[PDB]
Amino acid sequence: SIQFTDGYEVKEDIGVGSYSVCKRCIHKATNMEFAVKIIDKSKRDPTEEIEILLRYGQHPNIITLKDVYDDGKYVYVVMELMKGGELLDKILRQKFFSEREASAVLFTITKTVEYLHAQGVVHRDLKPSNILYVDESGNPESIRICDFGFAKQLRAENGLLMTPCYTANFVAPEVLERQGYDAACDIWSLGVLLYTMLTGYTPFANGPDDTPEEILARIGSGKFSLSGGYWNSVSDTAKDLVSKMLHVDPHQRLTAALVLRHPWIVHWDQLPQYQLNRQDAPHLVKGAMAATYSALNR
Ligand SMILES: */C(=C(\C#N)n1cncn1)c1ccc2[nH]nc(-c3cc(OC)c(OC)c(OC)c3)c2c1
Ligand code: NA
């Protein structure tokens, strides 16, 4: 009945689109700010994404869905609007940011992911530009995972919503092994975020110009520096977690659960409180992230 435009008016683009765009919008009733993701139904189906937001959006650190419309051609998904900026971007421009801090941020984010995996949900696009602060309080509880345009809910061949705990229905093997790939891959994305967090540079790209072939090469051989330069003042326990989060074999790689049982997370009070020495080139790290994931998606 009621139309999207009826109750909202569009504004600037807030970026990051695929078969879809995100624009700022004002609820022309209450004058509050929100985001809206406008998807092309002829280019992708948003159903699996919208449900995830409906069932799971309640999580404090999952972006909150406010509304949704369908004019038969596009789907409009009105969500929370982030005002604190992209989380990594803000973290890298803090000269006074220590390991105790990094462990809290990661705690909050892995806790969100672990839950999602317990409900048979995998993200599959956990790059940094999808994690944001909702406000400028700089508090972990203001962190938000914000897209889901690639997440998948585990389903039996029978069409049944499955959780990794209940197996008594039939799910195809290749779908299961893959649900273990996509979960491991999420953890690897977090490990990349952690790496960049501690040192101010990413593990497999120096900047946006790196060739897709050398980036992929670095990834395929695993092997990423964990000592010297900006790793000097970084504790051993942190380096241990990083190696196990970026472990080149998805199988030996840590689970969301196990990450959260790691001493770097549990005994966070042990962690050094002095500022981290890091490269300070946030725009370069931005380029390098996009180069890394591009080389992953093409
Ligand atoms: C657009 C989606 C998509 N696709 N998205 C989420 N994360 C990255 N891309 C989108 C959907 C809902 C949103 N709520 N707030 C924002 C938002 C994102 C960004 O990052 C570019 C901002 O700039 C830092 C921002 O500030 C206005 C809001 C958002 C994006
Ligand atoms: Na939420």
- The CATH 3.30.200.20 domain(s) of the chain lie at 1-44+64-81
| 21 CA closest ligand 1 atom index | 4
Pocket test for ligand 1, best of 16, 25, 66 (most atoms within 8 A of CB): 16
Q: Are 132 and 146 in contact (CB under 8 A)?
A: yes
Q: Which residues contact 149 (CB under 8 A, 6 or more apart)?
A: 18, 20, 37, 44, 46, 49, 125
Pocket test for ligand 1, best of 20, 22, 88 (most atoms within 8 A of CB): 22
Q: DSSP readout, 239-293?
A: HHHHHHHS-SSTTTSPPHHHHHTSHHHHTGGGS--SPPP----HHHHHHHHHHHH
How far CA 128 is from CA of 3, 72, 164, 272, in Å, comes to 33, 32, 26, 24
From the list 189, 227, 196, 184, the residue with the least C-alpha distance to 102 is 196
Instruction: Give the span between the Cα atoms of 68 and 50, in whole angstroms.
Output: 9
Q: Tell me if 129 CB under 6 Å of ligand 1.
A: yes
In sequence order, the β-bridge partners of residue 65 are: 79
Q: Tell me if 238 CB under 6 Å of ligand 1.
A: no
Helix (H) or strand (E) holding 136: none
- The CATH 1.10.510.10 domain(s) of the chain lie at 45-63+82-298
From the list 175, 60, 170, the residue with the least C-alpha distance to 122 is 175
240 is catalytic: no
From the list 149, 117, 144, 127, the residue with the least C-alpha distance to 50 is 149
1-44+64-81 fold: Phosphorylase Kinase; domain 1 (3.30.200)
Q: Enter the CATH code of domain 45-63+82-298.
A: 1.10.510.10
| 130 CA closest ligand 1 atom index | 7
Half-sphere exposure of 156 (CA within 13 A, CB side): 12
From the list 143, 105, 109, 108, the residue with the least C-alpha distance to 126 is 109
- Which of 45, 89, 125, 186 is flagged as catalytic? 125
What is the Å distance from ligand 2's center to 180 Cα? 25
Q: Are 116 and 122 in contact (CB under 8 A)?
A: yes
Annotated binding residue 8: no
Annotated binding residue 18: yes
Instruction: Give the span between the Cα atoms of 112 and 132, in whole angstroms.
Output: 13
Q: Which residues contact 256 (CB under 8 A, 6 or more apart)?
A: 110, 113, 114, 117, 183, 186, 187
**62: helix, strand or coil:** strand
What is the Å distance from ligand 2's center to 22 Cα? 18
Show the CA angle centred on residue 80, arms to residues 66 and 115, nearest 5°: 90
From the list 183, 117, 124, 129, the residue with the least C-alpha distance to 150 is 124
Annotated binding residue 201: no
Q: Tell me if 145 CB under 6 Å of ligand 1.
A: no
Instruction: Give the span between the Cα atoms of 288 and 188, in whole angstroms.
Output: 16
Instruction: Give the span between the Cα atoms of 116 and 198, in whole angstroms.
Output: 25
Half-sphere exposure of 41 (CA within 13 A, CB side): 10
Phi, psi of 232 (to 5 degrees): -60, -55
What is the Å distance from ligand 2's center to 85 Cα? 17
Judging by beta carbons within 10 Å of its beta carbon (0-12, 13-18, 19+), is residue 143 exposed, middle or buried?
buried
**56: helix, strand or coil:** helix
Q: Tell me if 126 CB under 6 Å of ligand 1.
A: no
Instruction: Give the span between the Cα atoms of 224 and 178, in whole angstroms.
Output: 25
Annotated binding residue 20: yes
Q: Say what the resolution is, in angstroms.
A: 2.6
With b meaning 16 or more CB within 10 Å and e meaning fewer, what string describes 13-29? ebebeeebbbbebbeee
